Design a protein around this motif. Sequence first.
Motif, PDB file in Angstrom:
ATOM      1  N   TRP A 197       0.857  -1.173   0.000  1.00 40.68           N
ATOM      2  CA  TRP A 197       0.000   0.000   0.000  1.00 40.68           C
ATOM      3  C   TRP A 197       0.896   1.226   0.000  1.00 40.68           C
ATOM      4  CZ3 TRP A 197      -0.681   3.254   4.490  1.00 40.68           C
ATOM      5  CH2 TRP A 197       0.124   2.879   5.571  1.00 40.68           C
ATOM      6  N   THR A 198       0.283   2.403  -0.055  1.00 38.68           N
ATOM      7  CA  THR A 198       1.024   3.664  -0.111  1.00 38.68           C
ATOM      8  C   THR A 198       0.563   4.577   1.014  1.00 38.68           C
ATOM      9  OG1 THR A 198       1.341   3.461  -2.497  1.00 38.68           O
ATOM     10  CG2 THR A 198       1.596   5.671  -1.508  1.00 38.68           C
ATOM     11  N   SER A 199       1.433   4.776   1.996  1.00 44.58           N
ATOM     12  CA  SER A 199       1.174   5.751   3.040  1.00 44.58           C
ATOM     13  C   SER A 199       1.266   7.153   2.452  1.00 44.58           C
ATOM     14  CB  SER A 199       2.192   5.572   4.176  1.00 44.58           C
ATOM     15  OG  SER A 199       2.094   6.617   5.106  1.00 44.58           O
ATOM     16  N   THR A 200       0.492   8.064   3.021  1.00 47.36           N
ATOM     17  CA  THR A 200       0.401   9.427   2.517  1.00 47.36           C
ATOM     18  C   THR A 200       1.377  10.391   3.185  1.00 47.36           C
ATOM     19  OG1 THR A 200      -1.453   9.690   4.012  1.00 47.36           O
ATOM     20  CG2 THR A 200      -1.975   9.268   1.718  1.00 47.36           C
ATOM     21  N   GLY A 201       2.158   9.941   4.162  1.00 46.20           N
ATOM     22  CA  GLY A 201       3.212  10.784   4.698  1.00 46.20           C
ATOM     23  C   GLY A 201       3.485  10.470   6.155  1.00 46.20           C
ATOM     24  N   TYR A 202       4.173  11.406   6.816  1.00 42.87           N
ATOM     25  CA  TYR A 202       4.609  11.151   8.176  1.00 42.87           C
ATOM     26  C   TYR A 202       4.802  12.453   8.948  1.00 42.87           C
ATOM     27  CZ  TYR A 202       9.291  12.586   6.804  1.00 42.87           C
ATOM     28  OH  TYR A 202      10.361  13.309   6.331  1.00 42.87           O
ATOM     29  N   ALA A 203       4.829  12.320  10.270  1.00 45.73           N
ATOM     30  CA  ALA A 203       5.261  13.393  11.151  1.00 45.73           C
ATOM     31  C   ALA A 203       6.143  12.794  12.236  1.00 45.73           C
ATOM     32  CB  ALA A 203       4.082  14.110  11.820  1.00 45.73           C
ATOM     33  N   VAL A 204       7.035  13.620  12.777  1.00 45.43           N
ATOM     34  CA  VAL A 204       7.910  13.244  13.887  1.00 45.43           C
ATOM     35  C   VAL A 204       7.479  14.047  15.105  1.00 45.43           C
ATOM     36  CG1 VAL A 204      10.278  13.176  14.758  1.00 45.43           C
ATOM     37  CG2 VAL A 204       9.817  12.668  12.365  1.00 45.43           C
ATOM     38  N   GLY A 205       7.125  13.346  16.176  1.00 47.85           N
ATOM     39  CA  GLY A 205       6.678  14.027  17.379  1.00 47.85           C
ATOM     40  C   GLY A 205       5.536  14.974  17.082  1.00 47.85           C
ATOM     41  N   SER A 206       5.615  16.178  17.638  1.00 50.47           N
ATOM     42  CA  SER A 206       4.605  17.206  17.430  1.00 50.47           C
ATOM     43  C   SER A 206       4.850  18.016  16.165  1.00 50.47           C
ATOM     44  CB  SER A 206       4.568  18.139  18.644  1.00 50.47           C
ATOM     45  OG  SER A 206       5.842  18.706  18.879  1.00 50.47           O
ATOM     46  N   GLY A 207       5.755  17.560  15.312  1.00 49.05           N
ATOM     47  CA  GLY A 207       6.107  18.278  14.110  1.00 49.05           C
ATOM     48  C   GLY A 207       5.005  18.246  13.068  1.00 49.05           C
ATOM     49  N   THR A 208       5.190  19.072  12.050  1.00 47.60           N
ATOM     50  CA  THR A 208       4.179  19.167  11.013  1.00 47.60           C
ATOM     51  C   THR A 208       4.232  17.940  10.117  1.00 47.60           C
ATOM     52  OG1 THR A 208       5.682  20.369   9.583  1.00 47.60           O
ATOM     53  CG2 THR A 208       4.227  21.673  11.026  1.00 47.60           C
ATOM     54  N   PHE A 209       3.072  17.580   9.598  1.00 52.83           N
ATOM     55  CA  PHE A 209       2.958  16.406   8.755  1.00 52.83           C
ATOM     56  C   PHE A 209       3.541  16.700   7.381  1.00 52.83           C
ATOM     57  CE2 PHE A 209       1.124  12.313   7.924  1.00 52.83           C
ATOM     58  CZ  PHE A 209       0.824  12.317   6.578  1.00 52.83           C
ATOM     59  N   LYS A 210       4.386  15.788   6.915  1.00 54.45           N
ATOM     60  CA  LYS A 210       4.986  15.841   5.592  1.00 54.45           C
ATOM     61  C   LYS A 210       4.184  14.945   4.659  1.00 54.45           C
ATOM     62  CE  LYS A 210       8.391  16.420   2.613  1.00 54.45           C
ATOM     63  NZ  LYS A 210       8.696  17.736   2.047  1.00 54.45           N
TER      64      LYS A 210
END
Length: 330
Positions: A197-210
């Motif tokens: 499948w294809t994930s739509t992105g990620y975030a680290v901790g409270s950081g903004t979603f990429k």
Amino acid sequence: STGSATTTPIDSLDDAYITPVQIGTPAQTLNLDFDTGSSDLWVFSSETTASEVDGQTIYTPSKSTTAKLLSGATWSISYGDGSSSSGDVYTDTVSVGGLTVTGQAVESAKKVSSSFTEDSTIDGLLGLAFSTLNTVSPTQQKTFFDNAKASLDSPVFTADLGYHAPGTYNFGFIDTTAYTGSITYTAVSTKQGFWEWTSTGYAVGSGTFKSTSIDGIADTGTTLLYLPATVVSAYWAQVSGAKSSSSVGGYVFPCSATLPSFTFGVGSARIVIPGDYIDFGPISTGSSSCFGGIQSSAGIGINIFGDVALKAAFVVFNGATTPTLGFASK
């Protein structure tokens, strides 16, 4: 029909999960590693080289009145971690959590590699990827799920892995009490035999979603989360003292650290992996260097949403005519 079975971590790190499986008549219960990344049901057996058995429970086909040798059939498999096994094949009755398949191919190990011998808690694997990956020759065999599908109330199974705790594999139904919110479904490619499948992105901790597409596989048989080097570097840069160690074989971090969470996207939805899930403990007994649960996929050839990721969600493996994957928070 349906089935429901509890799956239990093999150790205090959740290195893998074992689920009891009844094989043969009378039942022989073995604890198998349910693996959505492969498609062979294989067991330690009375045929396994004696020096390669060290505490596992073995299947003895000669004691099962429903076992039948699948004449001429052999199997041989190699896994992403370098481990391997091989042997011959019986058909027998196999039940998981009350759900019974007759005529299931039960692959009896004649040989297993050292890492299997060394893990006394895993009596074999039960593959739940697509049957196109099954290694039996000359007649490829179907997975347990494939054989049960037509009898199931719904053509699905679900993985609900616990963090440092037991969880559940269900077949044929979706336990609406086992998750919060809604299940977000996402497309699957079966072209490589995996739940890809294809994930739509990620975030680290409270950081903004990429927002970025990350193609990978939902793999209950892999312990850790393996992602592109860019993503993994962004995660570990938020942990003071973390570094990639060639000698250890991945990212390590000070055991005194508090790890940030890691979020991955499923469509518009978000699954949050708590920081604690990413701690795999000292690299060696007594060390203050701890092994990270998020590692680079650069050397694999595929991204792997293994247990670290999957245990943060309720995961639906939808084996309808067009398969899909579903993720919910829990």
